[PDB]
């Protein structure tokens, strides 16, 4: 994972040095931070039902040619096995605003994924409407704080940086 | 690798399940003692030269074996050697600390190290000796109960930072031995 | 007089000029880190284990005359080739002198400097393709997957490169058989200190110089280090 | 040397003598190196555009219709343009060895006397300041080479 | 610019030989061979403006959610690329027709192509859309000859290989 | 590489003089909107993807010769190299405005960069518009004037790091020139 | 040089990956802490003649034989050199107390130091008495603020444990 | 310079040998046809000043990025100096068709042209098409083959002269490249 603490141990163990006063103060932005990106971290993990239905049909609206056969949408446990890859991704989104960095995002979601969806005919642009959609839906203090909605946006526009 | 705040996540990814008020109180807490994390390898990283000279003279007062013609320490080149790798998994403790969890020593100081020492002739009974002697170093540091130093802090108590660090010394003096 | 390109004679402008000390700088920096890397083989008063040349008394000339000829190769690559060689081997330099500013200042000026001290880097702490021996078929299965897609750009569209050839004259590269065997068995046949000096140096080396913060290439170094020690750079196309 | 004098009176004395003046411009160009005879390239595309303005300076060392003027002749015995060959790569050989104080003067001298008397536009200063050896082999158009 | 004599004399430069009985004997299967991938050569080349447009509105024939506001092909100008690609392709193939191998699509149109159809947003399951329209439609002895077709199509379906 | 606290370090350094505190009240103020630096370059990297492709594609509308046969941007390997230093380039600008000075700039990226588009017959002139694209782009969203995407940040005025990247990609403009 | 900004700006340059936001978050905690340092900088920098007065002499309080003919410090001008010589390394951790990491003392202060005190014989086991004399002369609420002793303590037992 | 009388007989200064009638057998056949020659030569001087506006404007009619800002024919500076090197390409090709020999071009035209065309930013592939349709304009007018224009000519066979300047031409075509 690439977190806070998982970068500044590496620099340390690349210069074969201890952890000196630079990489105290990494730990000190992990103190004022964490109380805004775990503020959004329970409102995706108690909310996590919701988010997936009505998005995961956002992709299926902007792209509604994927029910004609041939395509990935075309039979119903297709379609459930496509709801599970979204909220595969808001699962790792709750992971990394938990751990502070973009480590199981790219550990487990990112790394490979350009290899697997040409090859199995799955378009990364309709994956990346329904990640999106989550976006600009989200209201800034009514579905969580305010640092916490620039918090929760951030890492989710970094996917979308990811698929294009 | 893994540190602390990466453990509940793959505990929850060990199931797919997600983060939430369930796990969170580990967590929540951890941001709390995190001004006394900070300042406990702050305290460590201060005097790592003597305390690596605590413990591989205090395995001299014990143990002259090394010195005798023979040994490990008879050279001057094995003694600086005995002098370097006291101090990485020092370093790598310090790194556990710092990381929450002592993921960084099963791959970078525990894994081959047994395979390592018995092609270097190394005495194991040397390895028990020199990290729970230093094991007692740690605390003294870490409790500021350490009689010929002394050092300001904040007030409060500091045995669950004096505990953890007791569960990574007895880790690494296992399998080497 | 008026310029070559109408009625003169003989070449014009031998004098040296700023390029020309440039390269005689950078030459000079290469013939001291080459020094200087040389001085962790040949620490005490005897040559070591592995700064030899060969066994047979023609075979240990044909070192040099092929390593002649492989500097020659670098010369003679392309000019995407000569840029894709200038920056990769400026960026493995800063993860080489990885702590200092100083260290890092002196190879974005110099070019072949940073050619000579990524090869030496990797030949002090040993962390080479050829002085690793892995000690099962378990790590070699390892070791040799990985050096087959570093020898993917050997050939980049299935048509090989210059900088892969071990060949160049008549019966030239039986010699490269056997040198190359000999330095299987002597890294196979070296001291017991020395070879799990290598095995950490190299799971060192992957580390930062490949893994990045990964935590499945950090797992799989840690576990064979001898297929961290095939891991080299991207200019080099063999 | 109307535009290199620097008082009035200097600029006066340009006009009533015009034989001065032409030893004037044979004054600036000798005490600053921005001849022909003492430009060096330091590399080969700024040796070829020294001949690219070569050729136009030969152009005027010819007639408009093509005959050889006498402005440009290397010759006039025989074996003179042997002797006269042999005699300019020495020269050309001596502009070689000049020291690094020499060749750093004359740089930032030659790109000095392309871009006042040699420059109307804005190219014509972009090729001095970068290629100053282009600067070198602008003649003055009275002399025919 | 893979092909027969390339791949043989850069073998031979390898180990530093000369063209030994091997090596003439792979430009002796380009006489056999040659003649059947040259005779569709000008076959494509003589008819090139009637293959890009019947066959290049085979993509937005299938794929017809890319002509709408948002996606690839949202106004002319994007369309008018869209049949110069198909057309870059068919040089591409073309051009492969007559080294006797995979020369030209290696270098200009299969190496580094999954990554600018990526940040472009460009779906590369509309391309294969195209390229394999071109790949049925081949009545045998009426395009070309019986073994004209095989070689002239075996480019086509290594594309989708590549695409894909 | 250095930043804009080590700038008047090694600015002191030359003259050897302990940094008082007089000369700190440009690094007092600089800490002060420690915050608007991250709000700035935050609206960078996550359009960081989308701002490439907004000024590669708008270089070849503009300059339509790159794509011709034979161009600079005909080979599909090309473009994918075009693609891939115009994300390179936005790496190291915001690097530099992350770190408030352009030292990691003219070392890391700038640094024998014009030599070799010269060598590689890049056209320079239309590189300097796949440059000034992306200042266009930078300067929008920071001060949020971006007109197919606002972002939510506290009101105030930034036009102050809306000169510092504009100053920067300019740095990039002279030195490729 | 290692600053707070300088190890995440080069641990990201490793991959070749953008500023994510694990790495704004270390930025972050170099704002909170700079204040607590900054305020140690110029209180440093308004009394550092008065600290080499005493840290000049304390060097030859315990080690008195430096003034024997026949070693290193045995003239007038070689103590006025030595009271110039921790002038340097009590500038180098002004220095730190700005960028807040080790970047001025690890090129500057120890990067040779143990080679040019070997061979001009300088002693480093009493040279690190007089860095080690300002450790525990620290008055924690009357030299300056509580938070600012912790860390530069904290730089100067660096010192101690870079030399020896 | 090395014409086709002065080529034979520095090979023959290689060695120093008398050059015999075996080697005047490709010098008298030669000699025989430079009627044709110098018919060929007229051809191409008399329609000199069109053929670099049929190349250079069909430059600009394939590639129409060379007249677009970023483009290297942009300006009217730059097309005026586009069509100055038209034709002097012209005429450094028309030296070496009277000479017989191409050691008038590879010399006094493009010795050092490809390290000037990349030092100024010279596009090299629309350089090529510059000189290319140059190529297919000669042995129309050596072959009397023009389509819009046809010279008056004795009857024979000119197949020679045709291919001997496109090998002329595409030395300018390897070189500039
Ligand atoms: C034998 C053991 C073995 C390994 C340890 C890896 C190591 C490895 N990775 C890559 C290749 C790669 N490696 C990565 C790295 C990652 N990808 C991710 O999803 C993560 C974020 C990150 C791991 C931490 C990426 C993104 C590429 C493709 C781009 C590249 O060539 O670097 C290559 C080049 C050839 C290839 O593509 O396979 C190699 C040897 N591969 C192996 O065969
Ligand atoms: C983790 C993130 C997180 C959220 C996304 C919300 C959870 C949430 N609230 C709504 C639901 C809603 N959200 C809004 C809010 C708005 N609608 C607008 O038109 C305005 C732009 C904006 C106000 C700023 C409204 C008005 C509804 C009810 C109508 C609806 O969308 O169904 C929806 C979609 C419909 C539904 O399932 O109910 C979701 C997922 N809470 C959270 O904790
Ligand atoms: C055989 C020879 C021999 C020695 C060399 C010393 C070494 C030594 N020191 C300690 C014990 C210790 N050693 C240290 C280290 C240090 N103490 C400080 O105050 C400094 C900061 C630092 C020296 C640079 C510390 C902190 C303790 C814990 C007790 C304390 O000092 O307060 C112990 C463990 C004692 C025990 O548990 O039995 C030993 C063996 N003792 C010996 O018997
Ligand atoms: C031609 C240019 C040139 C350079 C750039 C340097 C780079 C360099 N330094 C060292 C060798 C060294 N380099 C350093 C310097 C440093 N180590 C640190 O921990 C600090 C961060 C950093 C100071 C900035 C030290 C302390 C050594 C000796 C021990 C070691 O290798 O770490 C070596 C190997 C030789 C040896 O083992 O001694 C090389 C190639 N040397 C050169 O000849
Ligand atoms: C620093 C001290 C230092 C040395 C002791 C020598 C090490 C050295 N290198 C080579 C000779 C060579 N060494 C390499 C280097 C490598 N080959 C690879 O596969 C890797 C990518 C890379 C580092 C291992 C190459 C490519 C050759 C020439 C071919 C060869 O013999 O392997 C030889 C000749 C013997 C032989 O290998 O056959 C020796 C003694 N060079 C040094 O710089
Ligand atoms: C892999 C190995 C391999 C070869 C060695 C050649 C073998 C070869 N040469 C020729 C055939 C020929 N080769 C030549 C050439 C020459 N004749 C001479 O006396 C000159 C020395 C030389 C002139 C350059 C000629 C003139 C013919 C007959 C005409 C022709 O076939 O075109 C033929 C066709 C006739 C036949 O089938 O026998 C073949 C197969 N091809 C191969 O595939
Ligand atoms: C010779 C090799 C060669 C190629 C393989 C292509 C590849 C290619 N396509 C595009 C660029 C493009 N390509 C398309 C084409 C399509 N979009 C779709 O929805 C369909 C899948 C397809 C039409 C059938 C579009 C719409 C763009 C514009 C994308 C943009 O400008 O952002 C570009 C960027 C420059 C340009 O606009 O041309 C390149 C290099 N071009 C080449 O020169
Ligand atoms: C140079 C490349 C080239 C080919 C690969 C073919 C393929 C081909 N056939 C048709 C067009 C056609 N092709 C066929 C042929 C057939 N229909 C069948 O069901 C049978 C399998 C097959 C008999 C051989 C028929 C009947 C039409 C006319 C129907 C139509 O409009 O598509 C078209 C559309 C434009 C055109 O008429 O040419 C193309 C590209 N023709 C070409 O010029
Ligand atoms: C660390 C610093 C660093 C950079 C700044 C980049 C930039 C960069 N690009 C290229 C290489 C290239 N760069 C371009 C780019 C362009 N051509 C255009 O028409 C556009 C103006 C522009 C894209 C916007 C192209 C087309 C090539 C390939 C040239 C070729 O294939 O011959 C090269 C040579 C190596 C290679 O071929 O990959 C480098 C170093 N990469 C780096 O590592
Ligand atoms: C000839 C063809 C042509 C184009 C392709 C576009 C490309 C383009 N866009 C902008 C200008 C811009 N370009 C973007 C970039 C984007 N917009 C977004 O919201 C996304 C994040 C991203 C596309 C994925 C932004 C944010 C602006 C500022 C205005 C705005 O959109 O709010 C500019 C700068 C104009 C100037 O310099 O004044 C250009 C050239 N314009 C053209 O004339
Ligand atoms: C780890 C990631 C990380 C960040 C992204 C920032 C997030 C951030 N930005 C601001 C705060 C701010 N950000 C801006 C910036 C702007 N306002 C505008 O109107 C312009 C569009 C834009 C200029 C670039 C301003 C004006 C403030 C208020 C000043 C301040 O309190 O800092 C604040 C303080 C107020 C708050 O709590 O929201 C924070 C925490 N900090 C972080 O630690
Ligand atoms: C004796 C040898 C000799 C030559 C071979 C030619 C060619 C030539 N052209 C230019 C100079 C130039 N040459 C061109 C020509 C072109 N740029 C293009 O994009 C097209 C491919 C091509 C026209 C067809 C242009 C546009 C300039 C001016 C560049 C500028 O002003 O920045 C120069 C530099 C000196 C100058 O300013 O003129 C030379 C040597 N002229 C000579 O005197
Ligand atoms: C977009 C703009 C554009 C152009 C400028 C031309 C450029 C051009 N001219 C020719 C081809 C030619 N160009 C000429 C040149 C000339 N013809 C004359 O009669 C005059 C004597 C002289 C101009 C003064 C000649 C002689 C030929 C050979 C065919 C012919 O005209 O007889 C060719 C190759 C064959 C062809 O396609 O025609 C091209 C591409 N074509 C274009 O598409
Ligand atoms: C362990 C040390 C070592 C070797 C390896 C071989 C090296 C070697 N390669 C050969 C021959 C050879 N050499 C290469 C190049 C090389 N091989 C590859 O598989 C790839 C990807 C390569 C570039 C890096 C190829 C591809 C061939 C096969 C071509 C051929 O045999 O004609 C030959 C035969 C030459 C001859 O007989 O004339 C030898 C001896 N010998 C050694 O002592």
Known sequence: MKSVITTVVSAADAAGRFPSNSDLESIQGNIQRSAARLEAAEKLAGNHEAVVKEAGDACFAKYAYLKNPGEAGENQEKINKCYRDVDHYMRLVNYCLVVGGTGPLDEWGIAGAREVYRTLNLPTSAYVASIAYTRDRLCVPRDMSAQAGVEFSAYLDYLINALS | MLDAFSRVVVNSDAKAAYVGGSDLQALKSFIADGNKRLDAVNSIVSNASCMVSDAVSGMICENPGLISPGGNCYTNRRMAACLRDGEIILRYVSYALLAGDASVLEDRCLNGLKETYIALGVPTNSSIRAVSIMKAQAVAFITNTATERKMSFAAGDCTSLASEVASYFDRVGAAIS | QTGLVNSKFSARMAKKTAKQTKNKVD?????????????????????????????????????????????????????????????????????????????????????????????????????????????????????????????????????????????????????????????????????????????YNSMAYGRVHFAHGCSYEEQQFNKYPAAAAAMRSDSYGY | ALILAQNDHQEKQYIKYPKLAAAALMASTEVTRACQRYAVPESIEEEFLAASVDKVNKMRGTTASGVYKSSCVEGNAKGQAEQARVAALAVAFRSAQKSASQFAAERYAQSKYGRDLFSSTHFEEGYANTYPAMAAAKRASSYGY
């Not at chain 3, 200038?86 to 110099?110: D, N, P, Q, W």
């Not at chain 3, 997957?145 to 900088?163: E, F, I, T, W």
Request: hydrophobic share 40%.
């Open chain 3, 27 to 199: 030459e000079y920096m290469a013939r001291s880190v080459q020094r200087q890397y040389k001085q962790a083989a040949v620490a005490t008063g005897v040559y070591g284990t592995q700064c030899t040349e060969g066994t047979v008394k023609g075979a240990a000339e044909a070192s040099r005359s092929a390593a002649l000829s492989r500097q020659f190769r670098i010369k003679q690559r392309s000019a995407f080739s000569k840029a894709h060689d200038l920056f990769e081997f400026r960026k493995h330099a800063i993860i080489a002198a990885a702590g200092c500013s100083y260290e890092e200042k002196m190879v974005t000026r110099f070019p072949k400097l940073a050619a000579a001290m990524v090869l030496g880097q990797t030949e002090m702490m040993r962390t080479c393709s050829r002085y690793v021996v892995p000690e099962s078929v378990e790590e070699e299965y390892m070791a040799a997957s990985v050096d087959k897609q570093m020898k993917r750009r050997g050939a980049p569209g299935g048509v090989y490169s210059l900088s892969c050839a071990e060949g160049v004259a008549k019966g030239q590269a039986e010699i490269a058989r056997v040198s190359a065997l000999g330095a299987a068995y002597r890294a196979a046949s070296k001291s017991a200190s020395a070879v799990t000096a290598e095995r």
